[PDB]
UniProtKB/TrEMBL annotation, chains A, B, C, D, E:
Ca(2+) binds at residue 164. The keyword Lyase does not apply. Disulfide bonds join 125-138, 188-189. InterPro entries: Neur_chan_lig-bd, Neur_chan_lig-bd_sf, Neur_channel. The keyword Signal applies. This is Soluble acetylcholine receptor. The lineage of its organism: Eukaryota, Metazoa, Spiralia, Lophotrochozoa, Mollusca. Residues 16-203 form the Neurotransmitter-gated ion-channel ligand-binding domain. Mg(2+) 3 binds at residues 75, 191.
Length: 205, 205, 205, 205, 205
């Protein structure tokens, strides 16, 4: 019990906190989605609501430690306030994201951080033709708001979204769901900005 | 009056706070539900609202004390911010939980903590056939979001939900309410996670 | 001006804060209600909204002072964060209470504290027969959530609710409003709990 | 640039903050109202919503300074957190006030403070006869909740509300708007309380 | 990594924070708008909702640094709390602005700051004749609430609003969108106040 207390004190209280990634010291964030439900569809304003949980995984050299020196400790859970977290944002959002999970992450001895946030997102989607047998398709882009491609890079373990936890008695059934990596070029800035496209094809009843 | 002041100072201000349970030092939480009302039912989005107060108790060796040394003090009330609390979360939730009770807990000399939070939860539930004499059945699982089975375990004193405080003039009548223990395996993670399944069978009038 | 500054410094900054009442050192809280309006009535969910301001006074030996020593100061206003406040809660609520007044209280040299919070409460009430000449009757109980009868007692100066500030052009007119002290017994615990039952008889127009 | 930095440091960081007005050291707050819009009218609950920006100015001897000593500085803008602010509250409110302007005030060398908060208030108002050519009249009171007349007093520069900034294409047209001072006597307390009565006469179309 | 840490410590922790612009030391803030969607239109209350992200850039002599002294660092990302930000406010707003982007800005060695906040604003707009081929026109002014013309001056790089990121399948199509600089004279104050008028002409389908 005392060994875990001194590990946290040596990592956070002793050393100064991480000031984000540089173009000289970049970072790579692994992502992945778990779709749970398509709760609401509004035809009069063209905005659809989703319930899901995202995967936020990365590695830091500052968070590395030897388990033998701290009594065979391999990993530990800590508050999200104690460590740095990436600024992944949904671009086509209409209303601010509602958090449905605690703000805790888990760190491993190799310096790898794991954070899984539960969310309710309202985004821009035209649902014309949801009643037909063919269905309707909608998409949303996720990525850093401030960091470019030279500071933060995104990767996906699989291109298929996990639907094993999707709500059986939902008002809308999923036909296809994919998570694919993209490289954007905005008119504002010459620097490219990497993102992940969440594409969902759904139909009524 | 001075004896209670020095007990709190010796426990919190002197000793460092608990860093959560480890696989070497696990914890067991006792969970219990008191259903008060089924306030709203939405057919167009399949989401139902419940009013209830949950029961959560655990024991810690750090919170133990001798009553004779502190002037025969057996127990005391303290703010939830002063102590560690488990991360019990509802999985099938659609919107964030609303707290309806103060953030206070009561600690005993044996190191046992008692916390009773009042909540209003909106979760995924298809209410097709609530008007019928047979009624409709719905469920929701509660458990830790970050800690696995090796770190946190759950237990229930009884499998029957307390309906002695249920609202008499409610729009819906309860037919059966049960709180049963479960051990889950998710597609994400090899570690098994323990939860409590709340199952309610209700009907109109 | 300097005399009021040193009085607050001697009471709060010098002495440690009150750790709540004990079974050896109990407290008695005086409670009052001033009904202002019955703003909303929902028939589909059986929940009613009230606008009112509650009265709460209690005395503490720690907050006592001599006026002659601090330049004839009899009383002073201070933030609710600087002092201890009772955990009075409404039991039959469906949604969290909305505060409509500042978080300030007034303390007197005898150690008596005065706190008057303005609130908007939505509680459980069946409004069937509000349109009739007879009207409809509803009740809500206010009491401590954590402290038992041996720790906190409740008393009322009068059993008649103050309706002198009730809204004249309201959609609902009051026929009778009473505040009475009652002792509850919960199956959970052997300790009895005290509350104040707010009973209101109202009619449409 | 350095002169403004040392002025703020000498006033706030050096001297202790103002503990509010006393019966020995009173304060007078000048109030004003600029009506912008009557956005919503609810007939089923008798509650009307207004968009406006309130004016409040007071003087403090502690905030006085010599401009020649600090490089000809006459005034400066500062956060509302850095200084004391009066507890002006709307009495007939139904839901909490929404702030629509930044929390900044401007202080002058004579110790005079200027604060202009933009608000959206929902208050008690019966709108029966708004569709009539005569229109409907409603009123709301503003004043201190805790300090009485002997501590804080209120005054108005003019009795006519500023409608020069009122929304032209609004659903409701103003017929008359006045701001008048009052002295209210409460049964609770011996000290009388001062307020300002905002009376508005409006009609539909 | 250590070079970026000592740069932030030398700029913020060592030197006192900027106390805003003076009439002796004024500031010029460049403003821009990127319209994304016209999500909702309410005819019963005359209030329209927009989704967009604002551009704001200014320069400060205090935030200047030599890149060679800190290991060739040209720029860095930092929290909006660490630096001063202008008080740009929408005047015709009906409800508080919702933030849809992280609170981070990017500072360059020349002392130039870049801040891009994503927002959802509800403002006063009469939508009578949106169904017609001609459409309907609406405007909203943006500018400082406390600082005048002598302290803060606003400028625009172009008078044409960026519609390259506007939602294709929106319920309303844009006919014209312009951002123009204005100098307003209010009845309250002899001081002139500068704003940017955002004028949008839109039609249904
Ligand atoms: O930096 C900018 O926008 C940032 C980068 C990318 C593009 C949008 C979002 C936030 N991610 C910017 C700078 C000047 C003008 C417009 C946008
Ligand atoms: O750890 C994860 O999710 C946690 C554990 C369990 C499962 C959901 C909830 C939160 N409780 C995770 C790890 C990789 C991918 C997806 C989820
Ligand atoms: O202590 C408990 O509930 C408290 C005391 C009383 C009864 C409700 C409310 C909060 N006031 C409790 C403890 C275990 C199981 C059930 C209730
Ligand atoms: O102090 C009180 O109410 C305050 C003063 C005035 C009246 C209402 C509002 C708040 N302004 C009080 C004290 C005991 C009993 C009733 C009211
Ligand atoms: O200073 C004032 O209002 C400020 C300046 C401008 C005008 C509105 C908004 C906020 N910007 C004021 C001062 C006395 C009476 C009314 C308004
Ligand atoms: Cl949390
Ligand atoms: Cl609380
Ligand atoms: Cl407050
Ligand atoms: Cl602010
Ligand atoms: Cl943020
Ligand atoms: Cl208009």
């Amino acid at each position: 019990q005392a060994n875990l207390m001194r590990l946290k004190s040596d990592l956070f209280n002793r050393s100064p906190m991480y000031p984000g990634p540089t173009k000289d010291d970049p970072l790579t964030v692994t992502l992945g989605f778990t779709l749970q439900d398509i709760v609401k569809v509004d035809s009069s304003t063209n905005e659809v609501d989703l319930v899901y949980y995202e995967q936020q995984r990365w590695k830091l050299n500052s968070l590395m430690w030897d388990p033998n020196e701290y009594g065979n400790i391999t990993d530990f859970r800590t508050s999200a306030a104690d460590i740095w977290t990436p600024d992944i944002t949904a671009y086509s959002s209409t209303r601010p994201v509602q958090v449905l999970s605690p703000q805790i992450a888990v760190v491993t001895h190799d310096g790898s951080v794991m954070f899984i946030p539960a969310q309710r997102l309202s985004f821009m989607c035209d649902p014309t033709g949801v009643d037909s047998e063919e269905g309707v398709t909608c998409a949303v882009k996720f990525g850093s708001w401030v960091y470019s491609g030279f500071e933060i890079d995104l990767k996906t373990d699989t291109d298929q979204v996990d639907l094993s936890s999707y709500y059986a008695s939902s008002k809308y059934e999923i036909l296809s769901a994919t998570q694919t990596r993209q490289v954007q070029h905005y008119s504002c800035c010459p620097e490219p900005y990497i993102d992940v496209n969440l594409v969902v094809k759904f139909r009524e009843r």
